[PDB]
Amino acid sequence: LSEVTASSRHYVDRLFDPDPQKVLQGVIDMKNAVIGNNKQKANLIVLGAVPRLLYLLQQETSSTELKTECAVVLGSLAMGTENNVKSLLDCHIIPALLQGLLSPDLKFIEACLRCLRTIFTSPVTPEELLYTDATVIPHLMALLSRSRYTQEYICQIFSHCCKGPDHQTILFNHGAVQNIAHLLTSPSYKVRMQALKCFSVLAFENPQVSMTLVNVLVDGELLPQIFVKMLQRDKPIEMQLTSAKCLTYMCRAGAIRTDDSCIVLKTLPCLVRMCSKERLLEERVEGAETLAYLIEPDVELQRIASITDHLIAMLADYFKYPSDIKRLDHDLKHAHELRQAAFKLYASLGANDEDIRKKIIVSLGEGRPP
Ligand SMILES: [Cl-]
């Protein structure tokens, strides 16, 4: 490791200072020292700052300011390497943060939830820890709608830690769909985005939840009506793609009909707009694969898609060379993903109609099949 120098030790020592004012300023200086330095994070974790910080956040005498600043620093350490997250987990930070979530003060709750978000988002953290203690999910649900930060953080934690049907149903029984639906009308886009993500992963292959989503009412509008608005071009591209995913999944589960207006006039047209040359490579791959997921079961959708906004022409441009230098290198390295996506959509488009396969064969290269 990098040698530990007197500066780092002085930061950790100032926490043990006898004057409370000096301790508070020491934790503040510690937060300002780990902003960009992952090495400073590692040095302070090895010097034992995390146990002391947790103790200072546990004390009854500690002011709300000191508790908030200590939680902030603990989150800043969790923003570093995976080794740091493992060290913080080994110091039992999640239990302490869960006790901190019992606080009335909102800023302190936000700091603890920010730390929990970074931890649960990190790969080294097992998702089962979220469900190992049954009371944490109800407690998080209760805090879901106190601030935009609680909404965003708890949505991120849930969306990253759902993991499919079993504990997805655990989350559902605690009122996930009803409590998270209201966030889609929030004045904060960051919230509205994250809620969307929660729904997309929550309804991927769970027909039961999809049906529930069809009848959920948020601010006088049925939830699919909110999704359709989030397909509009004025909205950000992410918002659109994710909305389309939700609807396609709801359509695949049976909650929405393949002949429904939201699918043929909004969702599918939106997905072809994701396949344009102007779109990013990742967006083209996801739009194409999601459209293939949508159109695979129904022949009528396949035909409609084949005649929508020169889709088969745009797909041909997946095989053409790109036309910011790091993005260009990234697009030449990941071009295989784009070509593979094009073939997935071709396979779904031409599954039942030979004339569509003839159209694609002609589009992919010069020459007409016999
Ligand atoms: Cl942050």
For 164-223, the DSSP string reads SHHHHHHHHHTTHHHHHHGGGG-S-HHHHHHHHHHHHHHTSS-HHHHHHHHH-EETTEEH
The answer on 284 and 219 residing in a single domain is no
Is 155 part of any domain? no
Beta strands in the chain (DSSP E): 217-218, 221-222
Distance of alpha carbon 333 from alpha carbon 324, whole angstroms: 14
The answer on 277 and 249 residing in a single domain is no
Residues 66, 105 contacting (CB under 8 angstroms): no
Distance of alpha carbon 350 from alpha carbon 358, whole angstroms: 9
DSSP H/E element including 342: helix 335-349
Is 302 part of any domain? yes
The SS3 call for residue 61 is coil
Say how many Å lie between the CA of residue 340 and the centre of ligand 1.
37
Which residues make Cβ contacts (< 8 Å) with residue 72, sequence separation at least 6? 31, 111, 114
Distance of alpha carbon 171 from alpha carbon 331, whole angstroms: 38
Is 221 part of any domain? yes
Which of 183, 182, 192, 157 has its CA nearest to residue 171?
A: 157
How many independent structural domains does the chain possess?
3
DSSP H/E element including 362: helix 354-364
The answer on 352 and 264 residing in a single domain is yes
Q: Which amino acid appears at position 280 of this protein?
A: L
The answer on 250 and 264 residing in a single domain is no
Header resolution in angstroms: 2.7
Say how many Å lie between the CA of residue 54 and the centre of ligand 1.
19
The answer on 121 and 4 residing in a single domain is yes
Is 143 part of any domain? no
Say how many Å lie between the CA of residue 115 and the centre of ligand 1.
9
The answer on 7 and 121 residing in a single domain is yes
How many other C-beta atoms are found inside a 10 Å radius of the C-beta of residue 34? 24
Say how many Å lie between the CA of residue 266 and the centre of ligand 1.
36
Structure tokens at 14: 């100032």
Technique used by the depositors: X-ray
Residues 193, 238 contacting (CB under 8 angstroms): yes
Structure tokens at 98: 């869960």
Torsion sign over Cα 214, 220, 225, 229? negative
**Residue that terminates a domain, selected from 233, 256, 279:** 256
Distance of alpha carbon 247 from alpha carbon 256, whole angstroms: 8
Is 3 part of any domain? yes
State the Cα angle at 305 between 299 and 308, rounded to 5°: 150
The answer on 285 and 198 residing in a single domain is no
Q: Which amino acid appears at position 14 of this protein?
A: R
**Residue that terminates a domain, selected from 222, 256, 290:** 256
The SS3 call for residue 126 is coil
The answer on 175 and 90 residing in a single domain is no
After which residues does the chain show a gap where C to N exceeds 2.5 Å? 323
Is 152 part of any domain? no
Domain coverage including residue 314: 260-370
For the chain, the farthest-separated pair of C-alpha atoms sits apart, in whole angstroms, at 89
The answer on 302 and 250 residing in a single domain is no
Q: How far is CA 144 from CA 11, 133, 220, 229, in A?
A: 35, 18, 21, 24
CATH for 87:
1.25.10.10
Residue 217 phi, psi dihedral angles, 5° rounding: -120, 125
The SS3 call for residue 265 is helix
The answer on 292 and 209 residing in a single domain is no
Beta strands in 55-133 (DSSP E): none
Say how many Å lie between the CA of residue 150 and the centre of ligand 1.
13
The answer on 281 and 357 residing in a single domain is yes
The SS3 call for residue 31 is helix
Say how many Å lie between the CA of residue 111 and the centre of ligand 1.
9
Which residues make Cβ contacts (< 8 Å) with residue 164, sequence separation at least 6? 204, 205
Say how many Å lie between the CA of residue 26 and the centre of ligand 1.
20
State the residue for tokens 């159109």: 295
The answer on 302 and 214 residing in a single domain is no
Burial of 150 (0-12, 13-18, 19+ CB in 10 A): buried
**Residue that terminates a domain, selected from 256, 288, 313:** 256
Q: How far is CA 72 from CA 90, 114, 213, 319, in A?
A: 18, 8, 36, 48
Distance of alpha carbon 190 from alpha carbon 318, whole angstroms: 31
Is 132 part of any domain? no
DSSP H/E element including 41: helix 38-46
Is 46 part of any domain? yes
Q: Which long-range contacts (CB under 8 A, 24 or more apart) does 24-27 make?
A: 24/63, 24/65, 24/66, 24/69, 27/53, 27/56, 27/66, 27/69, 27/70, 27/73
Distance of alpha carbon 38 from alpha carbon 79, whole angstroms: 9
